[PDB]
Design a protein around this nucleic acid. Structure first.
Ligand SMILES: [Zn+2]
Length: 672
RNA sequence: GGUAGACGCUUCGGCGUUUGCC
C-alpha cells in the first residue's frame, strides 16, 4: 500500500504539473514514479493513449526499473520495453518507441536518435521521468535532451510537449555563498527541467521520519605519522632517479612551471607529468638517439610516478601496502637495460625497506583510530554491517589486506567494490563481479564489511549498513545526502576519519549548503505558480540565447607523421588515416601492419558498430606502448588508434606536437 | 575507440584521481 507521503509527492505530478520531487534516499521514489505513471496512462480517453519514457543513468538502475515497470503494468495492458547501449544498433528505434507505451531509456540513446532524426521531436512522448534529475547540468545527456525540449518550447514550432518529472534527493546549490545565490541555482535548475513545482514532504513529515532516519555523524580529526623512515628511503630513490634524468636532459628544472615540488604530493604528480610531455617532443637529428633519450626519460618519469604513488599510499595505509605496490610494479616491468638499472637500484634497498615495514613501531596512527572505531561498534553490536569509502582503488586493496592481516580484526570478513574501470585496460571490476559481492554483502551472507570507491548517485540498493566510514573521503552536498540512505534504520552511524582539516571543513560547508538548499526551497514553494513559471521563462530564454550565440576550424592539409610517444618510432602518416562515423580513426596500408602486435582484449564490449577483439601496442625494440585497439567493424577487422598514444611530427617544419583528443588535431580527414 | 559527471590541484590550458554512458 502507498504511504501518505508518497501520495503527497505524486500530487503535483498527477495534476499535470512539471514537478521536481525532492525526497530522502530510501523513502520509495520508485513507487512514486509508478503512482504518477499509473495516473498518467489512465487519464487519457478511449481514442487517445499516453507514452512514458523513464531515464536511467546506469545499466543496473536501467535493468532494475525495467523489471519494476514491467511486472507492475503488464497486467494492466501496457507494454514496457528498454533500449540500452547493447540493443541500440540495427534496431528500428522509432517502431520500438511507437509500439510500446513505457520505454525505460538510457539518456544517450535518446540524444543520439534526436540527432540522427530517427526520433524527430519529443512530441512522441507525453511524460518524461528523469531519475537523479540534479544531473541536468553542463553537458550531461539529461541537459542535451532538455535543450531539444526547450528549443521546441521557445521556438514557433508547435506540438504538444511531454510532462517532465524529476526525482532527486538533493537539487544542490552549486558554489552558492548565501541564500540568494542558492535560490538562483535552484531556479536555473528548475528552468533546465521546465519545472513549475518542487515537491517535498511537508504534511506527513512524521510518517517519513518513522521510515527513514538520519544517521548521526562523527568527525574524527587525527594526526599524520611523525617519523617516516619509509619516506627517507623512497625520497632517495626519487632524487637518484631525478639525477639520472639530469645527466640526459640538462636544465630539467625549467621543463615545468611547477616550482618547489615535494615528494608524495599532487603537485609533484602534476610536475612528473609536465616533464613527461616535454621529453616526448625532443628532436634529435640522429632519429636513433632520439629513440634512446626519449625512451630513457619516459622510463624515469614512469618510475618516479610509482614512487610518488607509494609515498601517498604510505601516508594513508601501511608501509607494507606501499611496498607491495612497488613490488608489483617492478614485477610488471619485468617480463630493458634501463629498467634493470632502476630495478637494481631498488632491489638494493629492498631488504632495508622490508626491515622498516615489518617494524611494529612504524604503525599508521590513522589506521589505529580506524581500528579503534571498528573494534568499538562490533564489540557493542557484533552483527554490525559496515561499508568503508576510500578515495583511490589502490587504497581499497590496501585496506583489504590490512584488515585481513590484522589479528585485532579477525571478526571482519572484508569485501571489495570498485568501478568497472577503463574500457581498454584490464583493471577495475566487471559488472557480474560487482553484483556477486553485493549479494554476499548481507547480514546472512559471507562478508561483514565492504570497502568501496565512490558510487553513483544512489545506484542499486545494497544491504543497510548501521555503520558507514568515510576514510579521507569528502564530496559535495548531493553525495552527503545520498550516503544517508546507506543506513536508514535508527542507530545508523557515519564516521568521517581524516588527517586533513580541509576535509572536515568541507563537510561542515556541505551541511550549511543543505540548510540553504532547504530554506531556499521552502520560500520558493510560497510563490504563485504563475510567477514561478514566468521567472524560469527568461532563464530558459537567456540560457538559450547564450547557447544560440556560441567556430568551425580550418584544417591543415599538410601531411604529418605519427610517432610512438615512448620510442618515437614512425607508425604511419596522416595520409593512411581514415575516419569512421566522424568519431573513430583507423590506418590503411600494409606498412602499418608491420608496426604493431595484438593481445586479446580483456573487456570485449561493443559500441555503435564495433566488436572489440584485441589491444594493439608498439613492436619496435619491444616498446609495448599502448596504441589503441583492434576491433571488427561491420565488414572487416581493423585497428583503431587513439591520438593520445602518438606525437604528431610535421614533415617540413619538423615540429612535434601533442594532441589529447582527435577533435583538437586538424588535418585532412578522409571518410572510411 | 569516443565520450559524460563528481572530487582535488591549477601558474586557468589543463593535470590527476574516481564513477559512468555510447
Ligand atoms: Zn613504441
Amino acid at each position: 500500500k502507498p504511504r501518505n507521503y508518497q501520495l503527497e509527492l505524486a500530487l503535483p505530478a498527477m495534476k499535470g504539473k512539471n514537478t521536481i520531487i525532492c525526497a530522502p534516499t530510501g523513502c520509495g521514489k520508485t513507487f512514486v514514479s509508478l503512482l504518477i505513471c499509473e495516473h498518467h496512462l489512465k487519464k487519457f480517453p478511449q481514442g487517445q493513449k499516453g507514452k512514458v519514457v523513464f531515464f536511467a543513468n546506469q545499466i543496473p538502475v536501467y535493468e532494475q526499473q525495467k523489471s519494476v515497470f514491467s511486472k507492475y503494468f503488464e497486467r494492466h495492458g501496457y507494454r514496457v520495453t528498454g533500449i540500452s547501449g547493447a540493443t541500440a544498433e540495427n534496431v528500428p528505434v522509432e517502431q520500438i518507441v511507437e509500439n510500446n507505451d513505457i520505454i525505460i531509456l538510457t539518456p544517450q540513446i535518446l540524444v543520439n536518435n534526436l540527432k540522427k532524426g530517427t526520433i524527430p521531436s519529443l512530441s512522441i512522448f507525453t511524460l518524461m521521468i528523469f531519475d537523479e534529475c540534479h544531473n541536468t547540468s553542463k553537458q550531461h545527456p539529461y541537459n542535451m535532451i532538455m535543450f531539444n525540449y526547450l528549443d521546441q518550447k521557445l521556438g514557433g514550432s508547435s506540438g504538444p510537449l511531454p510532462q517532465v518529472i524529476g526525482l532527486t534527493a538533493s537539487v544542490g546549490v552549486g558554489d552558492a555563498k548565501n541564500t540568494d545565490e542558492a535560490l538562483d541555482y535552484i531556479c536555473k535548475l528548475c528552468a533546465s527541467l521546465d519545472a513549475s513545482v518542487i515537491a517535498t514532504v511537508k504534511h506527513n513529515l512524521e510518517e517519513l521520519e518513522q521510515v527513514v532516519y538520519k544517521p548521526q555523524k562523527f568527525f574524527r580529526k587525527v594526526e599524520s605519522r611523525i617519523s617516516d623512515k619509509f619516506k627517507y628511503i623512497i625520497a632517495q630513490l626519487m632524487r637518484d632517479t631525478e639525477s639520472l634524468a639530469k645527466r640526459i636532459c640538462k636544465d630539467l628544472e625549467n621543463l615545468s612551471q611547477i616550482q618547489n615540488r615535494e615528494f608524495g604530493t599532487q603537485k609533484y604528480e602534476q610536475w612528473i607529468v609536465t616533464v613527461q610531455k616535454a621529453c616526448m617532443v625532443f628532436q634529435m637529428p640522429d632519429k636513433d638517439e632520439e629513440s634512446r633519450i626519449c625512451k630513457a626519460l619516459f622510463l624515469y618519469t614512469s618510475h618516479l610516478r610509482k614512487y610518488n604513488d607509494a609515498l601517498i599510499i604510505s601516508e594513508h595505509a601501511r608501509m607494507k601496502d606501499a611496498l607491495d605496490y612497488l613490488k608489483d610494479f617492478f614485477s610488471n616491468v619485468r617480463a630493458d637495460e634501463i629498467e634493470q638499472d632502476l630495478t637494481q637500484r631498488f632491489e638494493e634497498k629492498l631488504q632495508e625497506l622490508e626491515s622498516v615495514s615489518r617494524d611494529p613501531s612504524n604503525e599508521n596512527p590513522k589506521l589505529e583510530d580506524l581500528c579503534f572505531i571498528l573494534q568499538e561498534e562490533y564489540h557493542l553490536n557484533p552483527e554490525t554491517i559496515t561499508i568503508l569509502f576510500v578515495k583511490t582503488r589502490a587504497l581499497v586493496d590496501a585496506l583489504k589486506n590490512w584488515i585481513e592481516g590484522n589479528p585485532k580484526l579477525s571478526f571482519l570478513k572484508p569485501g571489495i567494490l570498485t568501478g568497472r574501470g577503463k574500457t581498454n585496460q584490464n583493471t577495475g571490476m566487471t559488472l557480474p563481479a560487482q553484483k556477486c559481492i553485493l549479494d554476499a554483502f548481507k547480514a546472512s551472507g559471507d562478508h561483514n564489511i565492504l570497502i568501496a570507491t565512490s558510487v553513483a548517485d544512489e545506484g542499486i540498493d545494497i544491504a543497510q549498513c548501521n555503520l558507514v566510514i568515510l576514510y579521507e573521503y569528502v564530496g559535495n552536498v548531493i553525495k552527503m545526502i545520498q550516503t544517508r540512505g546507506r543506513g536508514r534504520a535508527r542507530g545508523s552511524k557515519c564516521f568521517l576519519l581524516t588527517s586533513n582539516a580541509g576535509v572536515i571543513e568541507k563537510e561542515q560547508i556541505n551541511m550549511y549548503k543543505e540548510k540553504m538548499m532547504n530554506d531556499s526551497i521552502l520560500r520558493l514553494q510560497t510563490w504563485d505558480e504563475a510567477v514561478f513559471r514566468e521567472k524560469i521563462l527568461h532563464i530558459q530564454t537567456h540560457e538559450k540565447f547564450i547557447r544560440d550565440s556560441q567556430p568551425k576550424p580550418v584544417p591543415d592539409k599538410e601531411n604529418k607523421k605519427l610517432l610512438c610517444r615512448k620510442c618515437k618510432a614512425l607508425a604511419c602518416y596522416t595520409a593512411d588515416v581514415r575516419v569512421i562515423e566522424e568519431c573513430h580513426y583507423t590506418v590503411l596500408g600494409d606498412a602499418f601492419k608491420e608496426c604493431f602486435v595484438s593481445r586479446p582484449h580483456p573487456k570485449p564490449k561493443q559500441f555503435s558498430s564495433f566488436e572489440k577483439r584485441a589491444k594493439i601496442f608498439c613492436a619496435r625494440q619491444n616498446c609495448s606502448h599502448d596504441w589503441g585497439i583492434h576491433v571488427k567493424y561491420k565488414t572487416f577487422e581493423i585497428p583503431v588508434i587513439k591520438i593520445e598514444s602518438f606525437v604528431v611530427e610535421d614533415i617540413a617544419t619538423g615540429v612535434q606536437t601533442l594532441y589529447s583528443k582527435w577533435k583538437d588535431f586538424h588535418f585532412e580527414k578522409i571518410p572510411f
